[PDB]
Amino acid sequence: GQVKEVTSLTNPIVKDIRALTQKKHRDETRSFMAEGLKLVIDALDLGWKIKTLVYPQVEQVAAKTVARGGLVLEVNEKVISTITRRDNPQMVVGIFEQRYSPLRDIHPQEGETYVALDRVRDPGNLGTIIRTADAAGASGIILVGETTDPFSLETVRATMGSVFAIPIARANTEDFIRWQRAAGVQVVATHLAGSVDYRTIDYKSKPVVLLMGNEQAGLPVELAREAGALARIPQAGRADSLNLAIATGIMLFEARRHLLSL
Amino acid sequence: GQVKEVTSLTNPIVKDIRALTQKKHRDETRSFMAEGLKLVIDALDLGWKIKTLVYPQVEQVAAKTVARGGLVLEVNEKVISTITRRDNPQMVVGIFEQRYSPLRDIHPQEGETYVALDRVRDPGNLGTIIRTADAAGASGIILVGETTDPFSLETVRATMGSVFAIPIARANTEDFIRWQRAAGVQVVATHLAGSVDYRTIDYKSKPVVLLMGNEQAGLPVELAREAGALARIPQAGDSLNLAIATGIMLFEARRHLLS
Ligand SMILES: [Co+2]
């Protein structure tokens, strides 16, 4: 690794970072950006691999970076707010390697809760669910099919750091169904048609996978057939008009209700 | 003539619609924008005053609009995109009168829950909370102190139309405390110091007001002190998004009344 200074937007290295706004670029580098000195520090203690740092504590992190084998760019106020796209930005920004837990290395144990999200499309929702799942003590997030990107700048930010702290797995629909069948789990799916009251469900017998549907479409029948129980949250009309993050939060706090205490 | 065609983005009438991005014009006209044919329809059925309709059922809405006093504007898809500021926008847009309920006219009763937000600042939080309180059967939202505007475009959007369905009141801290003290309510405030587990509080004896602190400062002493109970949500290792936390509160306060 090495240190190097930059003040030009046209600089080769800066073009590469800004290109992480785009999904296709991030996928090819398997990389992503996270803003915040503190967050950068916490990420390192949790075993995240850092590729580039950008900006007194500042100086020992720069040290740790070069030591494991990656770059360090000192920069002007105009560059940092270009790459992070904020008029008034943070002084520090790390570029890390993405990580996904492979689905077949997940073996749910007693007391555990996972949240599986079928074709989640809103980065706000995805990031808020990740944070909430971490607050609630879930052991993992499983992204099923084509979802919005958990490592995009907008999702990461809405995690407030929880992206570093709870594992995330991705799978197509077939592999997910196979994994769930063989995992010995109670799959609780929110799905209006065929439902029981979320509060009457057995969350204690087996590890729980909470299966949530896509914001607009909801779960398809093939996922919904895979469920041990179909959940609804009773509302003041016969409508289900809950934001996906909110419903997901409600479900996490009920499923772990018997496990969370003051 | 109440129906009228416009081409030019320069056309005065289109500049005034775009002025509803500024808070000051919104406040002095008392008006605001809501996008979507189904939303405009539901607003008209819920009895909101439409000032302006911009664009089959469209024909039906257009006639409710002339019959209730409003103006109709037929326009190019360029025009519609420029007032919104959204790629691929809805094809119908309504401009409505703002409606606040005065606080003094709310007399809470047994089985009712209200949400009070202390200087909420994020438009997406405010909007999802309005929508969630609507879904849970809450009877009112109470904006306490300086808050983000519930009738901004960003808040209205995040409500999914719920801005039309649940009353909104606004009050300075002092009128809230005055109201609350005379209203016969159990105020349950999310606040860490002095708090109990949200699940052990008494949500049955009195109509409940859930009081949710500002996202970073939390509740000022004046409000926390008045609360009948201080609540908290047990977490693994205190940092829920305001709106998630409010949803969880609402669905516990109303746990005994929803089935
Ligand atoms: Co590339």
Ligand SMILES: [Co+2]
């Ligand atoms: Co004006």
